[PDB]
């Protein structure tokens, strides 16, 4: 359906980057390595929000950046790691919406790329990955932060994501169909292309009447995505293969022959 997502990265003052997504559309960023670190709009539907909205977001990141420089120091102490090594703290949370209500909220954390601590599906308990996260879970259980997570995920995350979908309905609630074509290269290869589609969810399959080479969906840089699927066929047998494209922007699916 629809999802608002946030990705926080603190690398060891430390480097703090925060990014917000609505579906596959980025709408906010924060970079501690900017000339004036602040919450910057990445989508036109969030640009017209008042200065009281943006300054509250900016001071949120500015104080979240300070919270991570001490957290990385506390994490370095839990594991007895050296003060010279670089370490990464990752923070992930968001809310999924068909009736416009919370389908699932999530909250995950990662230290150095492995799972550290995560809010449970009940939004009232935690799961620690090791004895270091048990100190963090006990820290957040004393503060009862899972209660504040309920207030955000079940509420603030849902109503504000619903507002973003309304102000940007011209682009967010609009599926761009892929522009497909087949290329042929001699090897002694039939590549099926898909360009300029939104969202990134697409299915590329080469049928004959497990052997396709898929690539991960890449961003075009304009808000759309690209992806191709290549298969190897013997010479004189190209007329037997048909590429199939499934996408939300397509009235009916597309079949393609060389």
């Amino acid at each position: 359906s629809h999802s608002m997502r946030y990705f926080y990265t603190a690398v060891s003052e430390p480097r703090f980057i925060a990014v917000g997504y609505v579906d596959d559309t980025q709408f906010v960023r924060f970079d501690s390595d900017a000339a004036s670190p602040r919450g910057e709009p990445r989508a036109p539907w969030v640009e017209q929000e008042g200065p009281e909205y943006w300054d509250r977001e900016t001071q949120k990141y500015k104080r979240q950046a300070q919270a991570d420089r001490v957290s990385l120091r506390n994490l370095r102490g839990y594991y007895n790691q050296s003060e010279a090594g670089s370490h990464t703290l990752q923070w992930m949370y968001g809310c999924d919406l068909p009736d416009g209500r919370l389908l699932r909220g999530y909250d995950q954390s990662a230290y150095d790329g492995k799972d550290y601590i995560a809010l449970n599906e009940d939004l009232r308990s935690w799961t620690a990955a090791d004895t270091a996260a048990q100190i963090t879970q006990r820290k957040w259980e004393a503060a009862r932060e899972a209660e504040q997570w309920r207030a955000y995920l079940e509420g603030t995350c849902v109503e504000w994501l619903r507002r973003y979908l309304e102000n940007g309905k011209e682009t967010l609630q609009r599926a761009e169909h892929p522009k497909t074509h087949v290329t042929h290269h001699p090897v002694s290869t039939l590549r099926c292309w898909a360009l300029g589609f939104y969202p990134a969810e697409i299915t590329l399959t080469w049928q004959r009447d497990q052997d396709t080479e898929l690539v991960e969906t890449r961003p075009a840089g304009d808000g759309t995505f690209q992806k191709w699927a290549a298969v190897v066929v013997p010479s004189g047998e190209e007329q037997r293969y048909t590429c199939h494209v499934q996408h939300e922007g397509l009235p009916e699916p597309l079949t393609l022959r060389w």
């Binding site: 949120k60 954390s109 820290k139 955000y152």
Partner: peptide
């Protein structure tokens, strides 16, 4: 709309 200030680890 981002999450408010979270407690430290």
């Amino acid at each position: 709309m981002a999450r408010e200030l979270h407690p430290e680890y």
